[PDB]
Design a protein around this motif. Sequence first.
Motif, short mmCIF file in Angstrom:
data_model
loop_
_atom_site.label_atom_id
_atom_site.label_comp_id
_atom_site.label_asym_id
_atom_site.label_seq_id
_atom_site.Cartn_x
_atom_site.Cartn_y
_atom_site.Cartn_z
N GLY A 88 -35.35 3.90 -15.52
CA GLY A 88 -35.43 2.84 -14.53
C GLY A 88 -34.07 2.30 -14.11
O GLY A 88 -33.86 1.98 -12.93
N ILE A 89 -33.13 2.24 -15.04
CA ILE A 89 -31.78 1.82 -14.69
C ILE A 89 -31.05 2.88 -13.85
O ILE A 89 -30.45 2.57 -12.80
CB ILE A 89 -30.96 1.59 -16.00
CG1 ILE A 89 -31.48 0.33 -16.68
CG2 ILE A 89 -29.45 1.49 -15.69
CD1 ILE A 89 -30.95 0.12 -18.12
N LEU A 90 -31.12 4.14 -14.29
CA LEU A 90 -30.31 5.18 -13.69
C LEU A 90 -30.71 5.53 -12.28
O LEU A 90 -29.88 5.99 -11.50
CB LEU A 90 -30.27 6.43 -14.57
CG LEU A 90 -29.63 6.16 -15.94
CD1 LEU A 90 -29.74 7.36 -16.86
CD2 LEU A 90 -28.20 5.71 -15.81
N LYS A 94 -28.79 -0.67 -7.71
CA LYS A 94 -28.18 -1.92 -8.11
C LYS A 94 -27.75 -1.89 -9.57
O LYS A 94 -26.65 -2.29 -9.93
CB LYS A 94 -29.15 -3.08 -7.91
CG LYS A 94 -28.60 -4.43 -8.37
CD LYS A 94 -27.48 -4.90 -7.45
CE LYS A 94 -26.93 -6.25 -7.88
NZ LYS A 94 -25.91 -6.74 -6.92
N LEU A 95 -28.65 -1.41 -10.42
CA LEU A 95 -28.37 -1.40 -11.86
C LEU A 95 -27.44 -0.29 -12.32
O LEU A 95 -26.65 -0.50 -13.23
CB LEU A 95 -29.68 -1.29 -12.63
CG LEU A 95 -30.64 -2.47 -12.43
CD1 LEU A 95 -31.83 -2.25 -13.34
CD2 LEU A 95 -29.93 -3.81 -12.73
N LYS A 96 -27.53 0.89 -11.71
CA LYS A 96 -26.76 2.01 -12.24
C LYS A 96 -25.24 1.75 -12.29
O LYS A 96 -24.61 2.08 -13.29
CB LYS A 96 -27.05 3.31 -11.49
CG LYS A 96 -26.31 4.50 -12.13
CD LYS A 96 -26.74 5.84 -11.53
CE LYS A 96 -26.16 6.99 -12.34
NZ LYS A 96 -24.68 7.04 -12.28
N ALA A 109 -27.56 -3.11 -24.74
CA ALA A 109 -28.11 -4.41 -24.39
C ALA A 109 -28.80 -4.32 -23.01
O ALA A 109 -29.83 -4.93 -22.80
CB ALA A 109 -27.01 -5.45 -24.39
N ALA A 110 -28.22 -3.55 -22.09
CA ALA A 110 -28.81 -3.35 -20.75
C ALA A 110 -30.17 -2.68 -20.83
O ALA A 110 -31.16 -3.12 -20.20
CB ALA A 110 -27.86 -2.51 -19.86
N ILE A 111 -30.26 -1.62 -21.62
CA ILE A 111 -31.52 -0.93 -21.76
C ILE A 111 -32.55 -1.87 -22.38
O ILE A 111 -33.72 -1.92 -21.97
CB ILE A 111 -31.38 0.35 -22.64
CG1 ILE A 111 -30.47 1.37 -21.93
CG2 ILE A 111 -32.77 0.96 -22.92
CD1 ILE A 111 -29.97 2.47 -22.87
N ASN A 112 -32.11 -2.60 -23.39
CA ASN A 112 -32.96 -3.59 -24.04
C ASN A 112 -33.51 -4.61 -23.02
O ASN A 112 -34.72 -4.83 -22.94
CB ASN A 112 -32.15 -4.23 -25.18
CG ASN A 112 -32.98 -5.14 -26.07
OD1 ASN A 112 -33.84 -5.86 -25.60
ND2 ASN A 112 -32.70 -5.10 -27.37
N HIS A 113 -32.63 -5.18 -22.21
CA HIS A 113 -33.01 -6.18 -21.24
C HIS A 113 -34.08 -5.63 -20.28
O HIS A 113 -35.09 -6.26 -20.03
CB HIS A 113 -31.75 -6.57 -20.49
CG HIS A 113 -31.88 -7.80 -19.65
ND1 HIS A 113 -30.97 -8.10 -18.67
CD2 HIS A 113 -32.82 -8.77 -19.61
CE1 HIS A 113 -31.32 -9.23 -18.09
NE2 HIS A 113 -32.45 -9.65 -18.63
N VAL A 114 -33.86 -4.41 -19.81
CA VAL A 114 -34.83 -3.77 -18.92
C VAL A 114 -36.14 -3.43 -19.64
O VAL A 114 -37.22 -3.62 -19.07
CB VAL A 114 -34.20 -2.50 -18.28
CG1 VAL A 114 -35.26 -1.66 -17.61
CG2 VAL A 114 -33.11 -2.93 -17.26
N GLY A 121 -37.08 -7.45 -12.45
CA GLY A 121 -36.67 -8.69 -13.07
C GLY A 121 -35.17 -8.71 -13.33
O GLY A 121 -34.47 -9.65 -12.99
N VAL A 122 -34.68 -7.65 -13.95
CA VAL A 122 -33.27 -7.54 -14.26
C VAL A 122 -32.41 -7.44 -13.00
O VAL A 122 -31.37 -8.10 -12.88
CB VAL A 122 -33.01 -6.33 -15.17
CG1 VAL A 122 -31.50 -6.13 -15.32
CG2 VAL A 122 -33.67 -6.57 -16.53
N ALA A 123 -32.85 -6.61 -12.05
CA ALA A 123 -32.06 -6.35 -10.85
C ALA A 123 -31.96 -7.59 -9.97
O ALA A 123 -31.08 -7.69 -9.11
CB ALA A 123 -32.67 -5.19 -10.07
C1 LIG Z 1 -28.93 -2.20 -16.32
C2 LIG Z 1 -27.60 -2.29 -15.93
C3 LIG Z 1 -26.88 -3.46 -16.10
C4 LIG Z 1 -27.51 -4.54 -16.67
O1 LIG Z 1 -27.08 -5.79 -16.96
N1 LIG Z 1 -28.14 -6.45 -17.54
C5 LIG Z 1 -29.19 -5.63 -17.59
C6 LIG Z 1 -28.84 -4.46 -17.08
C7 LIG Z 1 -29.56 -3.29 -16.90
#
Ligand SMILES: c1ccc2oncc2c1
Length: 175
Positions: A88-90, A94-96, A109-114, A121-123
């Motif tokens: 989902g991040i990759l 916005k997130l990648k 921590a990023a993967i955890n947050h997502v 929600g994260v984006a």
């Molecule tokens: C994917 C990339 C950057 C991030 O910052 N905080 C959560 C998160 C998820």
Amino acid sequence: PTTENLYFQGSMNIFEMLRIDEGLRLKIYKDCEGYYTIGIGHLLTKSPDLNAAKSELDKAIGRNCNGVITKDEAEKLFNQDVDAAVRGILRNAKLKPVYDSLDAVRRCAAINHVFQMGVTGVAGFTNVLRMLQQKRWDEAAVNLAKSRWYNQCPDRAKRVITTFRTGTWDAYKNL
Ligand SMILES: c1ccc2oncc2c1
């Protein structure tokens, strides 16, 4: 740090991290927000109908579980959920870039947050993402601590926030 202490970061990874934050439950339970959950933080449904949760469970595991699973099944589901968060991040524009800018521990921590909040929600955390990309770690952590995600359920999110602040595994030591 002792020899043992210097070994600790090699024992920590996203799986061990989320395992601590989410715990491990073999029966359906309600999470800190009251949502039916199982395994290692697997949200089954947001519906208050247990029958819906049980239905989702049997679909996810592939057998008649009647609300209960094995440790091995929990781990398989967990691995699938972790992969989904990473994917989902990759794929997200916005997130990648933010994720790519981060060190290995903050990437966890990023993967955890997502895993916890989902991709949209994260984006939607516009300011936090900019702060992280700019290595404004204290500001990023302070802003995460304003969020509903953290404030409605602090024990599940506190270690993730500390990890974004420090980029070390210290919050996961000495359970
Ligand atoms: C994917 C990339 C950057 C991030 O910052 N905080 C959560 C998160 C998820």
